Every structure is written in structure tokens, then in C-alpha cells.
């Protein structure tokens, strides 16, 4: 119950599996629905697949993809690192981890939500990353040309944009630090109508 590999137009739908760790390899339309309380660490998808996993009870994970799969995962894990150099799309429910390191190169659309102490984001081009519904104490953001980033840091925020890129801070953290090199843009993008929205202080004030 530790090995799972499927290639070549495979549709697997199942639930109610208890395990400690199993390794998954998927390719060529693995229509994979897994609705058990499944703990795992290593998943690989070659490309052109859709996968729904409902229920994850594990405490370590390290996934890296190459083609374009589409995954929706319910549960929580300590995600360690993530790299993408293709056509990556990703959505995740909950993460209560410690440190995150995200690298995106070619084309990326990532929606994550959870609680992280400290994270680093590197976006090169055509990367839309959301930190909506995701809170951090230490935020480090490096954005290059044509990148889109959402950051919801709580305590300390640090960001640099090179050119032609958009950064939106959805919450005022206790410490703010932003820089723009050529045409990078850092903006608040808030409703301006919240009945109990806090204002700036002496320490939080920065002037772009």
C-alpha cells in the first residue's frame, strides 16, 4: 500500500484509505479522486492531469511538477519548498508550516492558504501568486518583470520589485519595507470602507 503509479488515461476514484506514507506517480490524464484520510510526502505528475485529494493528514511534503496538472488538496502539511519551471497551477486548503521557499519561472497560478512563520518568494515572469487567506510573520518577496504577487504579512514585510510587476499588500503588517527598481509597483488595494480599519502609526509609515 506504499507504491502507486498510473499512466495512460487512467481514472481512479476511491476513499477511506489509512496510510503513513505512499509515493504517487501520475501521467497522461490520471483522473484521480482520493477522499480518504491519506498521509503522504512524495507526489509526481508528468503533465495534463486533474487531481482532487480530500483529506490529508501528514506533516511533511515536497512536490515538484514539470507539465501542467491541476490539483486541489484538502488537509494540512508542513510544506518545505516548491519549484516550478513550466505551466503550473495549484490550489491548496491549509498549511501550518515553519519556513517556505517558492520559486516560479515560466508560468504559474498559485493559490495557497494557511499559517506560515517565514516565507521567501521568487517570481520571474508570468507568475500570479496569491497570499490571500495566508498569513506570515516574515515575508520576503523578490519579483521580476511581469509578476503578480499578493502578500498578507502580519509582523514583518520585505519586498523588492524590479520592473513592470504588481505587488498588493492586503494587510498592514507591523513593519513594512518596499522597493521599486524600474517600474515595479507596490500597492495596498483595500476596500477603504471597513468600519474598523486601523490607520498608520509613526513606525509603519513609509513613503514610496
Amino acid at each position: 500500500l506504499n507504491r502507486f503509479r498510473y499512466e495512460g488515461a487512467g481514472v481512479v476514484t476511491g476513499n477511506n484509505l489509512r496510510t503513513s506514507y505512499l509515493d504517487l506517480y501520475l501521467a497522461n490524464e490520471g483522473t484521480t479522486r482520493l477522499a480518504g484520510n491519506i498521509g503522504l510526502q512524495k507526489l509526481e505528475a508528468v503533465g495534463n492531469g486533474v487531481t482532487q485529494i480530500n483529506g490529508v493528514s501528514s506533516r511533511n511534503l515536497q512536490i515538484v511538477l514539470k507539465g501542467d496538472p491541476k490539483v486541489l488538496i484538502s488537509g494540512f502539511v508542513n510544506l518545505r519548498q516548491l519549484d516550478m519551471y513550466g505551466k503550473g497551477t495549484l490550489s491548496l486548503y491549509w498549511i501550518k508550516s515553519d519556513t517556505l521557499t517558492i520559486r516560479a519561472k515560466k508560468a504559474a497560478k498559485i493559490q495557497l492558504a494557511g499559517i506560515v512563520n517565514r516565507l521567501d518568494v521568487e517570481l520571474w515572469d508570468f507568475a500570479q501568486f496569491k497570499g490571500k487567506y495566508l498569513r506570515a510573520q516574515r515575508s520576503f518577496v523578490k519579483t521580476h518583470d511581469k509578476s503578480v504577487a499578493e502578500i498578507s504579512a502580519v509582523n514583518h514585510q520585505s519586498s523588492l520589485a524590479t520592473d513592470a510587476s504588481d505587488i498588493y499588500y492586503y494587510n498592514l503588517s507591523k513593519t513594512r519595507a518596499d522597493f521599486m527598481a524600474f517600474n515595479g509597483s507596490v500597492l495596498d488595494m483595500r476596500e477603504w470602507g471597513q468600519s474598523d480599519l486601523k490607520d498608520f502609526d509613526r513606525y509603519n509609515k513609509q513613503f514610496p
Binding site: Y93, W94, A113, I115, Y133, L134, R135, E191
Partner: protein
């Protein structure tokens, strides 16, 4: 006994009590000390229950 939000998805919310007890809550359920959850607003950090209480983040 009091509760505070951790992270709000559209449809479900994460709660932590005063004792450290965790909770994942749907749009409609039952919570002791607050009653029945009536609306999950994910645009702002507010959720309203049947008893008339709104959960914010601690500071």
C-alpha cells in the same frame, strides 16, 4: 471560553479557542458559546453567529 480566527476560506473557517482547541467550521453548524454560524464573510475578518458575536483576530 473565547475563539479567534486563523484563516478563512470561502465556505469554511479555522478557529482556535482560548484553551488552544482547534476547529474547522462550515457555513452552517453549531458552536458552543456562540450558537449557530450564520454567515462566513471571507472578504473581511468578520463572521457572525446566531448569538450576535463577531470573531476578529487577536492582537
Amino acid at each position: 471560553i473565547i475563539y479567534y480566527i486563523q484563516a478563512v476560506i470561502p465556505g469554511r473557517a479555522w478557529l482556535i479557542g482560548s484553551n488552544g482547541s482547534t476547529l474547522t467550521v462550515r457555513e452552517g453548524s453549531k458552536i458552543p458559546g456562540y450558537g449557530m454560524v450564520k454567515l462566513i464573510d471571507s472578504l473581511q475578518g468578520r463572521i457572525l453567529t446566531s448569538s450576535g458575536q463577531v470573531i476578529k483576530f487577536s492582537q
